[PDB]
């Protein structure tokens, strides 16, 4: 009830939209924009492989951070965080990511609640996601200030390289990442760990 203020921006993966083991030695942190054209191939062909090869093995933690840089994306950005927080008790990144993926693979005035609500249907949650609640949360623009933290966070992280998709493996920064690039960097990280 009465506690100190929350951090402006968290210090551990546990408190970011993350799947896998939060204590894991390696952390993959990905930044994506709801409208980025280069992210469609990534979330569809690259992101799952990251999950399968490094996250499902307990080798890495996978964080996905949303950002809003081009007009028409804020509604979708709102919906993402609206779904991420569909349950007051527990944030479920699993629903939030699958929702994201569905948005990235969707074909400038595109982001409408109806389209955002339809994509949100049948979404797997740990006690279900309602359209009317989702539409209300989008119009409310609850998470405008949050997305500003994300933009500034991802910016300061990339030294201004505000382009997506951008994945961060350990302390390494890979623009327009591929699976080979990500794997090649992990091979180095496993090697340094071995040292």
Author numbering: 3 to 109, 114 to 132, 135 to 203
Excerpt from the publication:
We solved the crystal structure of CtDsbA, which was determined to 2.7 Å resolution by using molecular replacement methods. Consistent with all structurally characterized DsbA proteins, CtDsbA comprises a thioredoxin domain into which a second helical domain is inserted. In the thioredoxin domain of CtDsbA, β1 hydrogen bonds to β3 to give a β-sheet topology of 1-3-2-4-5, assigning CtDsbA to the DsbA-II enzyme class. In CtDsbA, the active site motif is Cys-Ser-Ala-Cys. CtDsbA’s dipeptide sequence is notable in that it lacks a Pro at X1 and has a non-polar aliphatic residue (Ala) at X2. In the crystal structure Cys38 and Cys41 are oxidized, with a disulfide bond length of 2.03 Å. Notably CtDsbA has a second disulfide bridge formed between Cys 84 (H2) and Cys 145 (H5) stapling this helical bundle. Notably L1 contains an unpaired cysteine residue, which to our knowledge is the first structural report of an unpaired cysteine in a surface loop adjacent to the active site in DsbA. In CtDsbA, Cys 70 is positioned at the C-terminus of the B3 strand, and directed towards Ser 75 and Met 76 of the adjacent H2; as the side chain of Cys 70 is relatively buried in comparison to Cys 38 it is unlikely to play a role in interaction with substrate or redox partner proteins unless this loop undergoes a significant conformational change during the catalytic cycle. CtDsbA is strikingly charged near its active site with a pronounced patch of negative potential in this region.
